[PDB]
Amino acid sequence: VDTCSLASPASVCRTKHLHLRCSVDFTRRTLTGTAALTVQSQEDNLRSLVLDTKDLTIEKVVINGQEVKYALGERQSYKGSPMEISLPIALSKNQEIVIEISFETSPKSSALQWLTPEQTSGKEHPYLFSQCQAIHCRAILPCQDTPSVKLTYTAEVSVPKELVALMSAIRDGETPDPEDPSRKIYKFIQKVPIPCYLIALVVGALESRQIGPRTLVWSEKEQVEKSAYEFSETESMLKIAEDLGGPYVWGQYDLLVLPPSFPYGGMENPCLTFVTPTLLAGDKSLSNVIAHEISHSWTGNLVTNKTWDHFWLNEGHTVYLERHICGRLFGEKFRHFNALGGWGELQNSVKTFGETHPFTKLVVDLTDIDPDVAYSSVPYEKGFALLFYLEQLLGGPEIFLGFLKAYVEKFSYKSITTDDWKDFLYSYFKDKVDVLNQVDWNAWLYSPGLPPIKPNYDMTLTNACIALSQRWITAKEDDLNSFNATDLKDLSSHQLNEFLAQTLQRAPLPLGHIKRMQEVYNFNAINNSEIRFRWLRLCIQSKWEDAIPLALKMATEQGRMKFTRPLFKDLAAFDKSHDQAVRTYQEHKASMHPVTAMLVGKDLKVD
Ligand SMILES: CC(C)C[C@H](NC(=O)[C@@H](O)[C@H](N)Cc1ccccc1)C(=O)O
Numbered sequence: 309v310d311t312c313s314l315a316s317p318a319s320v321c322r323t324k325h326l327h328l329r330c331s332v333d334f335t336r337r338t339l340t341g342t343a344a345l346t347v348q349s350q351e352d353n354l355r356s357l358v359l360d361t362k363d364l365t366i367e368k369v370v371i372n373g374q375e376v377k378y379a380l381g382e383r384q385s386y387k388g389s390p391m392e393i394s395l396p397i398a399l400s401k402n403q404e405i406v407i408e409i410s411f412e413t414s415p416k417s418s419a420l421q422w423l424t425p426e427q428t429s430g431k432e433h434p435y436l437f438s439q440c441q442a443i444h445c446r447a448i449l450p451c452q453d454t455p456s457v458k459l460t461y462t463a464e465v466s467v468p469k470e471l472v473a474l475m476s477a478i479r480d481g482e483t484p485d486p487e488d489p490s491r492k493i494y495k496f497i498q499k500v501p502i503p504c505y506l507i508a509l510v511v512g513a514l515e516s517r518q519i520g521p522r523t524l525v526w527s528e529k530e531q532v533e534k535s536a537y538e539f540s541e542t543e544s545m546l547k548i549a550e551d552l553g554g555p556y557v558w559g560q561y562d563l564l565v566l567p568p569s570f571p572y573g574g575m576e577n578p579c580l581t582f583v584t585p586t587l588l589a590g591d592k593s594l595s596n597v598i599a600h601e602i603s604h605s606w607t608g609n610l611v612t613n614k615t616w617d618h619f620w621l622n623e624g625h626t627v628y629l630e631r632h633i634c635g636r637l638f639g640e641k642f643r644h645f646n647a648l649g650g651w652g653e654l655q656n657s658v659k660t661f662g663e664t665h666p667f668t669k670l671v672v673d674l675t676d677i678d679p680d681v682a683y684s685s686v687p688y689e690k691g692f693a694l695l696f697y698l699e700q701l702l703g704g705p706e707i708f709l710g711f712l713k714a715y716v717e718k719f720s721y722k723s724i725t726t727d728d729w730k731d732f733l734y735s736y737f738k739d740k741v742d743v744l745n746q747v748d749w750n751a752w753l754y755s756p757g758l759p760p761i762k763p764n765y766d767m768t769l770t771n772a773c774i775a776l777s778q779r780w781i782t783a784k785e786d787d788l789n790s791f792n793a794t795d796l797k798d799l800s801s802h803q804l805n806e807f808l809a810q811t812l813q814r815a816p817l818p819l820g821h822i823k824r825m826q827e828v829y830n831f832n833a834i835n836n837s838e839i840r841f842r843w844l845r846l847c848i849q850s851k852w853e854d855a856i857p858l859a860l861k862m863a864t865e866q867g868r869m870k871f872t873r874p875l876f877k878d879l880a881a882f883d884k885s886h887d888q889a890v891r892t893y894q895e896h897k898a899s900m901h902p903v904t905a906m907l908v909g910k911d912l913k914v915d
């Protein structure tokens with residue numbers, strides 16, 4: 309039972325297919341069109357069904373070529389409004405009908421961001437992109453908005469002719485729009501069943517460049533070159549993921565680089581991963597994001613969480629595979645470094661929420677909770693730490709990967725729960741159940757706070773970071789002299805980043821120390837977004853006025869939530885920048901991604 313959806317559940321009826329015909333209108337910021345749902349009943353004598361919608365204008369509903377009765381219930385907050393459709397003929401178990409719904413979206417659709425030409429790189433054309441995870445697909449089209457249901461889809465999308473549409477599907481040709489030659493129709497087929505949260509659309513002045521046998525990179529013209537370089541390891545990453553998870557079943561693996569307001573680092577949309585332009589460090593150092601989204605092609609897009617309570621199944625297994633790809637690519641010691649980093653993110657989230665907070669549970673009860681509000685690292689890193697702890701318990705990586713590969717074959721095309729997962733883990737390791745019964749399942753799966761056990765981590769690459777961070781924290785004024793640019797001589801970008809994360813955990817440091825840090829390390833010059841983000845944070849919590857404009861600038865010139873939210877929060881907690889933070893939010897709010905807008909608003913205690 310999915311408590312984030314208002315639709316009839318999978319035990320009642322199941323959508324098999326969506327055919328979407330729609331037109332994008334930049335002048336009105338609406339999508340207008342029809343969604344044809346092929347719906348299979350799961351019960352005897354079914355006479356009505358319920359769909360999720362949110363800020364949708366329904367014009368009519370047609371079955372067998374006749375307008376039919378339907379109604380929108382009362383809005384229930386972030387869930388939207390349930391649509392009740394009256395079937396003209398009762399259906400028997402397993403019967404299929406096609407239900408064609410005529411709809412239009414609101415400009416305020418929580419799924420969409422409409423960009424003005426000034427908000428893009430080229431400056432001549434507007435741009436639109438979607439983000440359906442978790443429950444925003446209902447703000448684009450009426451659907452059973454729950455991952456407990458999987459459907460194939462095809463779409464035809466009319467856009468101004470000088471623009472391009474792409475979707476989470478195989479692109480299947482373009483032509484002039486016969487209803488209006490100022491426009492093109494682009495067509496798309498997704499032949500592999502998916503949860504609706506993987507539906508995705510972009511429309512904009514895009515070009516593509518080929519970067520491997522089954523990958524094109526797409527973005528505005530002025531990002532293409534740098535993007536092809538930055539993501540050049542992509543094919544080699546697919547080769548390792550195939551080896552780990554089994555065949556890649558989706559045809560194409562493309563990348564779309566979005567404008568800087570894209571709320572996430574990456575979003576694993578089938579055939580077309582979306583990434584933030586803040587990944588473009590110049591040196592491929594941030595590619596673990598591509599490896600993570602690649603991994604979802606098995607864990608997440610094949611095997612899917614039945615409800616969002618079980619999100620950890622999605623993210624935990626994926627981070628587990630991301631870290632393996634990275635370990636194959638760069639060595640096992642690098643996997644251990646990144647894993648220990650992750651536990652560090654875990655300590656931070658739990659500290660922030662508080663150790664008894666319900667959102668620190670691996671499995672969460674989402675009734676009444678907006679998933680955008682509950683989102684944190686907890687399901688990623690607590691989930692990852694569970695799998696890493698099981699790996700050490702059951703005899704190392706190669707053994708645990710045999711389970712991962714078998715778990716994917718097993719649940720491919722399905723949606724599963726935490727108990728579905730646990731059960732198969734007991735079945736697969738039947739010769740080791742005695743070891744499995746020493747795991748504190750109730751603590752790991754259902755208790756708040758840090759996990760009860762911390763796995764074993766190689767420290768090789770981590771030591772230099774902890775050591776340099778300890779020198780700075782224990783330094784007094786008379787020790788500042790002895791820091792030099794040569795302290796950084798042997799640290800990769802990743803270790804510089806880990807150095808700052810260590811140091812930020814003990815923030816604030818004295819203002820003197822920070823000034824000296826900039827003097828000898830020149831962190832202000834570093835354009836790597838992870839590093840600059842933590843270095844700006846450390847600056848603002850240590851109350852260094854000069855960092856105020858640098859922080860405001862980063863928080864607004866890009867909008868990846870990971871960076872934008874804690875930058876605004878920090879700035880607001882600093883008395884000197886409090887007013888400017890609140891003012892800047894209010895000045896930028898209207899042209900922000902609507903989900904980012906809402907969360908930053910909450911965080912700042914505004915409106
Ligand atoms: C390496 C990963 C941790 C990168 C991470 N991206 C992800 O986790 C994606 O796979 C997630 N699917 C992003 C997401 C989750 C929930 C709701 C909306 C969007 C991100 O930072 O965006």
Ligand SMILES: Fc1ccc2[nH]ccc2c1
Nearest residue numbers: 616619672679682683687
């Ligand atoms: F959107 C989501 C989904 C699953 C989750 N599990 C813990 C937080 C959380 C947020």
Ligand SMILES: [Yb+3]
Nearest residue numbers: 479480481497
């Ligand atoms: Yb075709």
Ligand SMILES: [Yb+3]
Nearest residue numbers: 731732734735
């Ligand atoms: Yb069992």
Ligand SMILES: [Yb+3]
Nearest residue numbers: 784785786787
């Ligand atoms: Yb001293």
Ligand SMILES: [Zn+2]
Nearest residue numbers: 600604623626
């Ligand atoms: Zn993910």
